[PDB]
Amino acid sequence: VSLMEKLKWKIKCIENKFLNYRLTTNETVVAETEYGKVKGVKRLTVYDDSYYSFEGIPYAQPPVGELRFKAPQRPTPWDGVRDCCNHKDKSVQVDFITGKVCGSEDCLYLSVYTNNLNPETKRPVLVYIHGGGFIIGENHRDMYGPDYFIKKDVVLINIQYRLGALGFLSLNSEDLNVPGNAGLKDQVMALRWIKNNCANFGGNPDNITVFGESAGAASTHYMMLTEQTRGLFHRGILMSGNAICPWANTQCQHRAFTLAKLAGYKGEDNDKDVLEFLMKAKPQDLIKLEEKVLTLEERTNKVMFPFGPTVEPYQTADCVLPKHPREMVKTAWGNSIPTMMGNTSYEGLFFTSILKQMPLLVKELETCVNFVPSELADAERTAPETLEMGAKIKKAHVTGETPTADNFMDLCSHFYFWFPMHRLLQLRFNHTSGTPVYLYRFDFDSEDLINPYRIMRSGRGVKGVSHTDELTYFFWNQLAKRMPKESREYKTIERMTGIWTQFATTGNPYSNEIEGMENVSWDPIEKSDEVYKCLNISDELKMIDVPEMGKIKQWESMFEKHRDLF
């Protein structure tokens, strides 16, 4: 990231700290948890609303030393009053603005917010899981501010979990107790805490919604798939992601060794000796080197992250993913709770930045063999069947004689988001009690209000609704400003937070009390639907057939001779 956005972000960081002090009050309050009393503080928003803020609530033991790479354990309870008036640190990770490593292994905390500690009725509980490819992200209010949601009568909860190799190291040897998915096991234990404690904050323990974007969406879906969380919540929102997305799982058991070798390990490739080195390496050295772990072949096969969720090699007490996600959908308790899912109108536009560094990637669309789902393609991507599948993809997105960046970014939308969503809906239909799933399409474009991800994707002055453009209308961030209330941006905040809280409340997203929704008949998706219908959200709200549908069927036709793998 540029020197200009480094000094520019440095200043907004300093501004956010002064604003945060200014927007603080002297009104401290104490609440009960099952681990002991916590002290929160009331804060202000730029729209002159206020809310109670409890930050740095531990939901697990600090996962340092011998707990590193291990499943999380419950934290130690305390007498007296724990101070929760400041944020804790984020998970160790590479800062996308600077490139430096930041964070700390002591990262397993959650934050609780609400405009009213003592409502007269129990409120809907909303749990946000941040995205960031399981390698970056945080629950700090400079990125995920509760300011829009607290205008509503809900309890909002933002969790943290272990990122990167510290969150997702996986070792085959059963003796070492590092099966993998530690960061997911973090999420589980946070859910268990939320279930047992939300009532102390005015929340309804029998009406909890979990939602997240991108990796947060896959996390949310995983929380709906695993037996570990059965019955913990009651609604799910998957925003631009799920667990059968190609980036949302990987078998990474051989990559621990590689990571060790990059970090200076001297010895052989057995898990024990590899683990011992990794257990004593500086946390910020492991994280800085993750970028180098993937081989060139893996990058070629569109593997995006070296460490991440994985099928665990053996089963233990806190096992989360004992089978491939496709197999888990067939039994998942979460299939039988109300679900909302959606994408933005130009997802792949996120990859503008990457193309700017590798213009050579555009040539991949001459055959598109690289984008063939990996389970169908051969190793070298050279078998004639793979070239055939590649051609079907090519017909879907290459509009002219030569592929363009727009073709490329259009393909990504489907490879990373629309196709996986389609596969999941069809799978779920064959294994579900018939609980409704609703679809949305986020199509609202604006440059007058942005969020930090636009700096990373180099989305400065770029038309189109990219992946993560919707976050801006859900959360406050240190790049936000107060918008006039008649603005299109402000209306979208109201609609977006309106629908999400409405869904969280009733398992049904429609409300005539939301501006723009007076002509809307939002029906859920039936198994017999050949065409998906979705709420298109732009300056106006409108029910439509998913425009991406024809391209989605093209991708499905790659499985014509391999229908068992669909």
Q: What is the DSSP string of 371-397?
A: GS-TTTS-SSS-SHHHHHHHHHHHHHH
Cα Rg of the chain, angstroms = 23
Domain ranges (residues) in the chain: 1-566
Burial of 280 (0-12, 13-18, 19+ CB in 10 A): exposed
Q: Is-catalytic flag, 548?
A: no
Tell me which of 3.40.50.2300, 3.40.50.1820, 3.40.50.300, 3.40.50.2020 is the CATH number of domain 1-566. Answer: 3.40.50.1820
Residue in 214, 219, 413, 466 annotated catalytic = 214
3-state SS track over 479-545: CCCCCCCCCHHHHHHHHHHHHHHHHHHHCCCCCCCCCCCCCCCCCCCCCCCCCCEEEEECCCEEEEE
Q: Is-catalytic flag, 397?
A: no
State residue 412 phi and psi, 5-degree precision.
Answer: -55, -40
Two tokens at 565? 């793998």
Q: How far is CA 451 from CA 8, 23, 214, 389, in A?
A: 14, 20, 15, 37
* Displacement of CA 439 from its chain's centroid (Å): 17
Q: How far is CA 328 from CA 222, 247, 334, 416, 460, in A?
A: 9, 17, 10, 20, 40
3-class state of residue 213 by DSSP = strand
3-class state of residue 361 by DSSP = helix
Contacts of 299 (CB under 8 A, 6+ apart): none
DSSP conformation class of 95: -
Two tokens at 515? 């501006």
Cβ neighbour number for residue 59 with a 10 Å cutoff: 24
Residue in 105, 213, 312, 347 annotated catalytic = 347
Burial of 58 (0-12, 13-18, 19+ CB in 10 A): buried
d(CA 566, CA 556) in angstroms, rounded, equals 8
Two tokens at 338? 């109300």
* Nominal resolution (angstroms): 2.4
Burial of 164 (0-12, 13-18, 19+ CB in 10 A): buried
Residue in 422, 467, 494, 511 annotated catalytic = 467
Closest to 191 in 3D by CA, of 219, 167, 154: 219
Closest to 481 in 3D by CA, of 51, 87, 16, 6: 16
Q: Is-catalytic flag, 214?
A: yes
DSSP conformation class of 246: T
d(CA 466, CA 444) in angstroms, rounded, equals 10
Two tokens at 122? 């129990």
Closest to 184 in 3D by CA, of 231, 140, 134: 134
Two tokens at 403? 């592929």
Two tokens at 459? 């989305």
State residue 503 phi and psi, 5-degree precision.
Answer: -60, -45
Sign of CA dihedral 430, 431, 435, 436: negative
3-class state of residue 87 by DSSP = coil
d(CA 291, CA 95) in angstroms, rounded, equals 13
Sign of CA dihedral 483, 16, 353, 305: negative
Closest to 355 in 3D by CA, of 314, 391, 407: 407
d(CA 204, CA 394) in angstroms, rounded, equals 49
Partners of 537 in the beta sheet?
A: 442, 541
Q: How far is CA 320 from CA 228, 324, 344, 384, 453, in A?
A: 7, 11, 29, 38, 29
DSSP conformation class of 74: P
Q: What share of the chain is helix, strand, coil (3-state, %, to 5)?
A: 35, 15, 45
Strands 109-114 and 155-159, by their bridges, are antiparallel
Residue whose entry in the numeric block shows the structure tokens 């007076």:
518
Using a CB cutoff of 8 Å and minimum separation of 24, what contacts does 47-50 make?
Answer: 47/147, 47/151, 47/482, 49/115, 49/147, 49/150, 49/151, 50/25, 50/115, 50/150
